[PDB]
Design a binder for this molecule. Structure first.
Ligand SMILES: [Cu+2]
Ligand SMILES: [Cu+2]
Ligand SMILES: [Cu+2]
Ligand SMILES: [Cu+2]
Lengths: 217, 235, 244, 244, 217, 213
């Protein structure tokens, strides 16, 4: 039909950037005057709402995405034709671009932001405004998208199905080990190196000498 | 503002705070209120908290809603760390120039080396004006003035953003000149060598020569402007 | 007509749009992982104008900085012979930081960008990258690469930094503007004394504080480089395993 | 009937008596190795009622405790799909400890069992084992397994512990009963100060001391778990080598 | 004849538990009043006797066991019949059960016991009562039994003979590296994991499909 | 012709031991009275001369040796006859003996020497007399010889040519990681073993078993 859709990716990119934009805006407006005393009841309504909401909302969002993808798993995966595999890979490269950006937000943006809010309070708790967004929002979110990209490849692509790419395995799981080292040389998930190389190998296979050498030198 | 949550017995048996006073509980942007007071260094200093041999005086406030112009404790101008002797009392004061319009709850604060923050009393301090109007300023030894709120930020961007753009050039260059997939596949097959080999390396050696030259220049210039400079003053 | 692509345009079209998607997802990605690591280790020296001294800062930052530039190089050069590894990481970081310093240190909390601006890395990154370009060797990079990376750091920062090392007299004491910017724009939790900047020793002789710092930064960067290059390799692993 | 056994009884009989011999020799075995390791590291917080505080003890013990549970699991579940690994090790320790506290700390030297009783592990041990039973994955156990193990620790000790955190007034000072038990039954070498129990800090906020401890103990036990799983594996090695 | 004896194992179990029972009793009686001043001459007769006895007694006991087992080594070991190999394994599982218990005493009992004696003296030397039993008795003892089990298997079983099981190698030798860290994460001997797995592999081989699948599912 | 020359090795040995002998003698005479105040101008003429001279001199001497050896590389190296290979090996054993001694001076003599000069000054700089000789002389020198021996083998011996012996690679490069339980270059173990493997091969059963048991 067509190998390259993208429609879904843009749904993801837009649906996300928008959301954080809202959140960053909101925290501009209720960070300042509303999240400075944690013992105040204006904190229970504007910040402790978010924490108590998003956790069970993330948890379900997670298992849902997992469960669903395994359900709609392709039960005769080895049969996939070259054009459908190609299409399935370009979906996976999609999932990784939305993963990419979920990472940006939750690891750079809301992470170093907590750095500036440290210099703004002396601290009431470890449920500060930035902690809520950084630790209990942005991190779990990019952690869900991750599990997604992982389950999706596991249930659509022969290679990733029957196996467990270690690179990928790491990328999906590493996220549950950011809590230690520390409360905020090192063990990290650039495992995406392995995963794009594994994607790239399939793409090199899925063109005969025809595409390979000829079309591209 | 979190004093509430700190351990009760510790707030009681470290710093004992008295006669704390705020010049004015309202200021204009650029208008120069002052917070002062006295503190007695409890005599049976808890184990939990470093000895106050190294401490630092502070305005407990949500960011630079007030610039601090100066501060003093134990009869010294104290922009650096100072020793507090167990059992004695010290007097302090902080000169606070309004900056951001609102109603902030401003505290006297001292932090101990291996201790953490100890928060004194705090009073609401209505500021009014437009932040756009806030200035410093400050005088160099050479005699000139500079508005701190803005000084130097120009020059910074001037050097950072060009280089970031340079960095992004370098990347977009190689990218669209030999693809990811193309170059992957080339490498994956025999070669490689198609992907690089001079005069790709001529580009490199040149780009690098310019980079270093861009540095020696930028150095020498910024060395001519500001040919004085001293190291950060600490201790 | 060129299966599993129909046209030659359906091929070359999908290639050029995957080439972007990777380049992008890969961009951050490493930016995400690099930033979290760096911020967690090299702080701190990078947040504050009043940490950027002559000893600690131009030592810890090149050393902690070379990490992802090494692994990123191990990734782009070995698999694609693309000589932008180090720059791909260095830039990643800078954006990530700058965006935050602007949008948050300033935008949200309002510290002047004169207080909260990052360390300059792109010049070193370039040196690193071109040394791997010229010699094709990571071993040569690891030596003459990282040694450059170390040396160039302070030189390439000076242009942004000099400005703030101008001297002011304050209440009968000397300060640099930088000390002042720090002192002025009040940080709830940052007592001078937490700093970790040079404070003098009896074993200093000169007049030498920066060159030593930079050469030291240089030689140590050599080991970090290796370790991180082979970690870049271990991270590029396509190994598939059978059970969990 | 079935060579090298004569009867079907001579088979099924020998099988069932080796099954015991294994389970026993394996039981201790790991008890010995678990105890020594654990006694050496987690002390100490385990011997004394006046070390069992809110911060240290519920941190170090989970973290030091999960080690052999993870390694015992690696052995029982991978080779026998038997879901009792953690419990096999947790109990092992407890028996080995309790025996000692009774026969020695008390039988030989006469410290009241109220002073010298061990930390309760069997509840977490079970959570840990059941997680590996349900998911068949060590990866999942590592995460939701150890995170449970972490959080359940204080809870499952409280029943034995509360009784001693009742307040007494001694010479115009407040003590818990535990403190006093320690104070009373005189240890030749154990000056309060050696303890390593919570003593307060300015960065405590609440009213939170135990929750944070356990969560911390949880998230750290994830790492210990992994490591000790693959070490449980490394130790399971049937490799034969040629010379020494 | 019969594969499963056990008679020998009981000889070991009984001969040991008894001995430690005696020793623990003895130390109840001479620990208290006799082993509190090491400068007293009552210490030379009740405690420093044991130390000076057991070491050369252990040393000979050790080499004896080793030498002897190597001598009575089966010089045509590859010939062993499936019934004799099965008997030989069930002896080896025996050795390990006597090892198991020699470990329990030496590593848990007399080891954690030293912890309580630490709180009973301020110390005259490092030849306290418990140190004599723990370090210079219980440890060497289980260390001999280990060397035994190892040598026994080496000279009776084709597999263990010609080779050096790594697991076993460790289990026998690790004992000589308990003295360091400390003189009074980590490196340990659960090497028995590999040894019983090596034993278990021979048992699974020594039954045809007949025993294997059939008799047992 | 002959497998075993040695003439070249003695040129090395003699040309080195002499030079260091001169240098040590020099530092006896100008170390004492001349190299105690680094702010004095007698320091600029007697010690800071050497520093500024040797480094570019070492740098050129280095690249020279390497460039040259690569150039004079044997372009048909697999062809080498068993007698020529044996000669080439015995040259390579030479290089290593000149290396061995350049190591001794650089890493034992002038290194532990700095430990005694440490107890003779309180320090003006890190360009002390000993530091000049130790770090900027003896070390670079042996480092050059190493790269020499490495390049020599690389361009004369089928084995070392096409490959990169790991031991040898280390031996030649580890020198550039001395500036920063330990990490060291006894990589010569592997290299002599690599040399010994070719010697064992270049004798038939004839030499091997027979001539030598
Ligand atoms: Cu935080
Ligand atoms: Cu307040
Ligand atoms: Cu002892
Ligand atoms: Cu020296």
């Amino acid at each position: 039909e067509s190998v390259v859709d993208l429609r879904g990716m843009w749904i993801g990119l837009v649906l996300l950037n928008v959301f954080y934009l809202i959140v960053r805006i909101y925290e501009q407006v209720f960070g300042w005057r509303a999240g400075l005393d944690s013992f105040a009841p204006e904190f229970q309504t504007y910040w402790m709402s978010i924490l108590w909401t998003e956790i069970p909302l993330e948890l379900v969002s997670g298992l849902g995405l997992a469960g669903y993808l395994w359900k709609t798993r392709d039960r005769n995966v080895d049969a996939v034709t070259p054009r459908e595999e190609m299409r399935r890979l370009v979906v996976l490269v999609q999932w990784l671009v939305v993963y990419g950006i979920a990472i940006y937000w939750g690891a750079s943006f809301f992470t170093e932001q907590d750095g500036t809010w440290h210099m703004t309070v002396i601290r009431d708790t470890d449920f500060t405004p930035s902690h809520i967004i950084e630790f209990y929002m942005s991190y779990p979110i990019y952690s869900v998208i991750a599990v997604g990209a992982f389950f999706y490849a596991k249930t659509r692509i022969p290679y990733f199905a029957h196996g467990y790419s270690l690179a990928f395995l790491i990328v999906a799981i590493g996220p549950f080990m950011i809590i230690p080292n520390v409360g905020l040389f090192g063990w990290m998930a650039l495992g995406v190196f392995g995963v794009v190389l594994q994607i790239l190998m399939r793409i090199h296979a899925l063109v005969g000498k025809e595409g390979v050498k000829l079309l591209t030198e | 503002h979190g004093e509430k949550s700190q351990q009760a017995f510790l707030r009681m048996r470290t710093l004992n705070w008295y006669d704390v006073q705020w010049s004015k509980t309202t200021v204009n942007v650029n208008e120069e209120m002052v917070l002062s007071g006295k503190v007695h260094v409890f005599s049976a200093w808890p184990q939990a908290v470093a000895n106050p041999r190294v401490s630092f005086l502070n305005a407990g406030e949500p960011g630079p809603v007030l610039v601090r112009t100066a501060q003093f404790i134990g009869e010294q101008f104290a922009p650096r760390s100072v020793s507090l002797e167990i059992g004695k009392d010290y007097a302090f004061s902080i000169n606070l120039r309004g900056r951001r319009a609102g109603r902030w709850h401003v505290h006297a604060q001292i932090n101990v080396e291996g201790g953490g923050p100890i928060i004194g009393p705090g009073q609401w301090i209505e500021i009014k004006g437009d932040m756009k109007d806030f200035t410093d300023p400050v005088t160099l030894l050479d005699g000139s003035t500079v508005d701190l709120e803005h000084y130097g930020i120009s020059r910074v961007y001037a050097w950072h953003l060009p280089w970031m753009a340079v960095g992004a050039a370098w990347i977009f260059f190689w990218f669209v000149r030999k693809g990811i997939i193309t170059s992957y596949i080339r490498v994956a097959e025999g070669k490689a060598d198609d992907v690089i080999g001079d005069d790709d390396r001529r580009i490199g050696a040149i780009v690098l020569a310019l980079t270093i030259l861009a540095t020696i220049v930028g150095y020498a210039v910024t060395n001519s402007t500001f040919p004085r400079t001293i190291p950060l003053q600490a201790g | 007509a060129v299966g599993p692509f129909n046209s030659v345009a359906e091929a070359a079209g999908c290639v050029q749009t995957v080439d972007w998607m990777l380049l992008v997802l890969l961009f951050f990605a490493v930016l995400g992982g690099y930033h979290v690591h760096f911020m967690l280790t090299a702080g701190d020296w990078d947040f504050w104008v009043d940490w950027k001294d002559r000893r600690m800062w131009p030592t810890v930052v090149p050393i902690l900085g070379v990490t992802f530039c090494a692994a990123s190089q191990a990734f782009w050069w070995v698999n694609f012979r693309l000589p932008f590894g180090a720059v791909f990481a260095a830039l990643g970081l800078l954006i990530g930081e700058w965006i935050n310093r602007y949008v948050n240190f300033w935008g949200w909390t309002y510290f002047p960008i004169s207080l909260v601006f990052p360390s300059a890395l792109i010049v070193p990154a370039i040196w690193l990258d071109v040394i791997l370009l010229l010699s094709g060797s990571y071993v040569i990079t690891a030596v003459v690469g990282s040694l450059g990376w170390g040396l160039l750091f302070y030189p390439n920062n000076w242009p942004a930094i000099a400005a703030f090392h101008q001297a002011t007299e304050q209440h009968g004491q000397l300060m640099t503007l930088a000390d002042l910017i720090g002192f002025h724009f009040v940080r709830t939790s940052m007592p001078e004394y937490i700093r970790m900047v040079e404070r003098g020793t009896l074993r200093t002789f000169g007049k030498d504080v920066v060159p030593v710092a930079a050469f030291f930064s240089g030689f140590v960067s050599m080991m970090v480089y290796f370790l991180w290059w082979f970690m870049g390799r271990w991270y590029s692993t396509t190994k598939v395993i059978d059970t969990i």
